[PDB]
Design a protein around this ligand. Structure first.
Ligand SMILES: Cc1cc(C)nc(N)n1
Length: 126
């Protein structure tokens, strides 16, 4: 069901949380080789999460589930804010700009924590 597809998407989201927190520790410790690998892992995870979310939104639309479509439109919009910040973080790492990396890292954390009430709302709506 679309509901079980959303639980699979939620797990991929939690995997990115886990890797992101490990990556933050590596960044603080100056282990740039680890950071590079974690950033590649996160890009793959976000790409997967984004695709699963789009399929869920498209299905909710085909089902006529108006409330779920509303919430998923809002949620995917916030997802893109996170993605833009993530991409900027990756660029800051490439450029050696640790000040911007720190800034983007904190912003991505706050964007992500803010989106969690909506994430739970969607599970109930599907
Ligand atoms: C990139 C991103 C953004 C938001 C709001 N939530 C998640 N899980 N991932």
């Amino acid at each position: 069901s679309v509901k079980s597809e959303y639980a699979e998407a939620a797990a991929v989201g939690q995997e990115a949380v886990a890797v992101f927190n490990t990556m933050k520790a590596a960044f603080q410790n100056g282990d740039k080789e680890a950071v590079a690998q974690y950033l590649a892992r996160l890009a793959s995870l976000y790409t997967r999460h984004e695709e699963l979310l789009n399929r869920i939104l498209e299905k909710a639309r085909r089902e006529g589930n108006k409330e779920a479509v509303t919430l998923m439109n809002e949620f995917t919009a916030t997802f893109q804010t996170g993605k833009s910040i993530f991409n900027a973080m990756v660029a800051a790492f490439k450029n050696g700009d640790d000040d911007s990396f720190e800034s983007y890292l904190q912003a991505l954390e706050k964007v992500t924590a803010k989106g969690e009430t909506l994430a739970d709302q969607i599970a109930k709506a599907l």
